[PDB]
Design a binder for this molecule. Structure first.
Ligand SMILES: CCCCCn1ccc2c(C(=O)Nc3nnnn3C)ccnc21
Ligand SMILES: CCCCCn1ccc2c(C(=O)Nc3nnnn3C)ccnc21
Ligand SMILES: [Co+2]
Ligand SMILES: [Co+2]
Lengths: 382, 382
């Protein structure tokens, strides 16, 4: 059941912002590893004396990488006179975030009808303000509230081309990489306690529970906007298990709550994973270990309806996971952590079914793969 | 004249250590961009709870990228019980370095006969101690003194395979990239005052002046070991010029003195630059703007002895600079800055001449290219 209870008009995921120590090196690694184009910049060359910000795009997916310059470059500025293109940026907050968490997502940004209204309604409904609404060049409004840990939910609204003060990247520097990724499907937080986290976020957004999960080491639940295109799962650890909770491992290495993974939808997950796997050892991203061939021997018994044995053969080569709802089927795979710490990682997914356009969350989030991978591992020892 | 006055036995450049916020992303970017192999690691997976360190190699060139983990992972350790593999590492020093300078070189490491003797003699001769000699697994001794700014000169000596506690990288993760780079040729510091800097470094090493330079915006001089294989140039700015000194720009954006560039010798600079230029826009390194065709039209008049017109044609395609000594010829090119700030960059070089092996510094360091590039620019306006 979908009570359609959003307290303000939400459209789509807009962008994800990473706070880095060096935005250049992270952005170039991600660009090559994920096949994203360099599409906009705000930095010294555009007159920004405060922060360096580089935008990568693939389809509708927008990854922003930001790092501070020396505060000495902008010591004479005040907020009214700032050369920053993102007004919520703060040297001290950014350095504190990165020193505490390492490389990670600072902002999950959603496009709304009216960012000032969204901020006002959010705060009136319990949200903790982070950055008040600010109008950029009478064209875009941006506002931020706290989501979990040091991650903020960022509202962006446009009157009528990322942000004012960002310049389009010249095509000689913008190589048209594309491995098939097209949009952000969901963004998942890890927190120490799920109940209070859900009550807080659902409280100021009005997002409704879409799904929920629960020996796997976690409990989780998914918050969703009215049309269920903005999906915000949250995990908490389950203590006492023989194998230690990876949610707890995350919290320890991340120094508390934060964004656990970003799921990126591909229009052709086989092409995406072929392209990403070719680059894993030459600057790209590594993938989690493949499931045993038992898992794929069982796959015919569960999705032989949807995938040909040739297409299942291809899943086995690429190490792709498959799960199935009563409503749709999900193809998914997980990278190893994106940086030094065993914290944030990326999920590549593709959904089949729920045609009306495709409805959000078609096929779920892969809950069934906990059991079937444990079963497949038991069957391999044989 | 070479007074051969080293106060201790110096062998060769051993490695360069970068202090990063995320070693993973910088190391993968550098590996792809420069064609270096992932060859050793010390991190969580090897039991290091303190820092993540990844070693890249090409020929004899060794680039080390290190970042701190959360201090909470190692809060119960003390120096006698540390899981760090580099004993000079300190969470606070590393975070302070990176927050102040951004991505940069922390250590210029040279292999010596006896690192404890080298440290003792250095300090007895005015060096500022940074990390006392420490014996690792009765196999390697490491010690550090201050060089300039927050950069240290690191001594390493081996009794009889990077460092103890580092593990060789498994070949499945170690892709054998190689674009022709073979060793570090020289490493250059920028300081506010050259005299005191030279007096300090030459004082504790006994390195002798190899060369010196001086409207270009700087004054410089080169310190060299007995056989002139360890070359340590130092630059200071020249104020008042119409165009602002890039040495001064460095000092402002770096928050003081530091390492300006690393010159990497290639066994085939044409292959190296073809390979690096192919990757500039897909995660690698960008190069400084090419000199005008006038520069190459003049090149026949100065090195037509050494390079065929076909080989000069190839320099023009790749944007390679050429300078010439009375003793040898130098091919060189410069990258754009390696990170967000206009601070550290890389030079690719190849030397021809001075065959005995090749003697160090053959062809100089390119001083003649200041005039000839200014001349070539004047001739292009035509
Ligand atoms: C034993 C590992 C085998 C794969 C099990 N496995 C299945 C899904 C999944 C997610 C994930 O994608 N979780 C999510 N995404 N949105 N909501 N949630 C809760 C993250 C980490 N391991 C996962
Ligand atoms: C106007 C720019 C045209 C190139 C002029 N140009 C010639 C050499 C050079 C170095 C360099 O390599 N300097 C060095 N290396 N070792 N010692 N020194 C002093 C660094 C930056 N621009 C340089
Ligand atoms: Co997921
Ligand atoms: Co040089």
């Amino acid at each position: 059941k979908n009570p359609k209870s959003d307290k303000f008009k939400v459209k789509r995921f807009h962008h994800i912002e990473f706070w880095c120590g060096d935005a250049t090196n992270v952005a170039r690694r991600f660009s090559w590893g994920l096949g994203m184009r360099f599409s906009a910049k705000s930095d010294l060359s555009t007159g920004n004396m405060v922060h360096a910000s580089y935008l990568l795009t693939s389809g509708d997916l927008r990854f922003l990488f930001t790092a501070p310059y020396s505060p000495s470059l902008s010591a004479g500025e005040i907020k009214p006179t700032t050369t920053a293109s993102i007004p919520s940026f703060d040297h001290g907050s950014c350095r504190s975030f990165f020193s505490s968490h390492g490389l990670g997502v600072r902002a999950v940004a959603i496009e709304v009808e009216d960012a000032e209204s969204a901020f006002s309604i959010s705060v009136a409904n319990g949200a903790i303000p982070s950055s008040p609404p600010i109008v950029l060049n009478e064209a875009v409004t941006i506002a931020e509230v706290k989501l979990y840990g040091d991650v903020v939910l960022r509202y962006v609204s446009y009157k009528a081309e990322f942000l004012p003060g960002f310049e389009r990247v010249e095509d000689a520097s913008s190589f048209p990489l594309d491995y098939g990724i097209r949009r952000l499907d969901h963004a998942v937080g890890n927190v120490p306690e799920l109940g209070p986290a859900l009550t807080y976020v659902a409280g100021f957004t009005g997002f409704h529970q879409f799904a929920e999960f629960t020996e796997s080491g976690l409990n989780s639940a998914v918050l969703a906007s009215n049309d269920e295109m903005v999906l915000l799962p949250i995990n908490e650890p389950v203590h006492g298990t023989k194998r230690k909770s990876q949610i707890q491992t995350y919290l320890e290495h991340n120094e508390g709550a934060g964004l656990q993974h970003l799921a990126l939808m591909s229009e052709d997950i086989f092409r995406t994973l072929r392209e990403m796997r070719k680059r894993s050892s030459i600057g790209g991203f590594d993938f989690m270990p493949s499931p045993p061939p038992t898992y794929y021997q069982n796959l015919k018994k569960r999705v032989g309806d949807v995938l040909s044995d040739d297409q299942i053969k291809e899943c086995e080569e690429l190490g792709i996971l498959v799960d199935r709802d009563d409503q749709g089927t999900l193809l998914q795979i997980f990278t190893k952590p994106l940086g030094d710490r065993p914290t944030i990682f990326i999920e590549i997914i593709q959904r089949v079914g729920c045609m009306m356009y495709q409805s959000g969350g078609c096929g779920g989030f892969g809950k069934g793969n906990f059991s079937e991978l444990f079963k497949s591992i038991e069957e391999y020892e044989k």
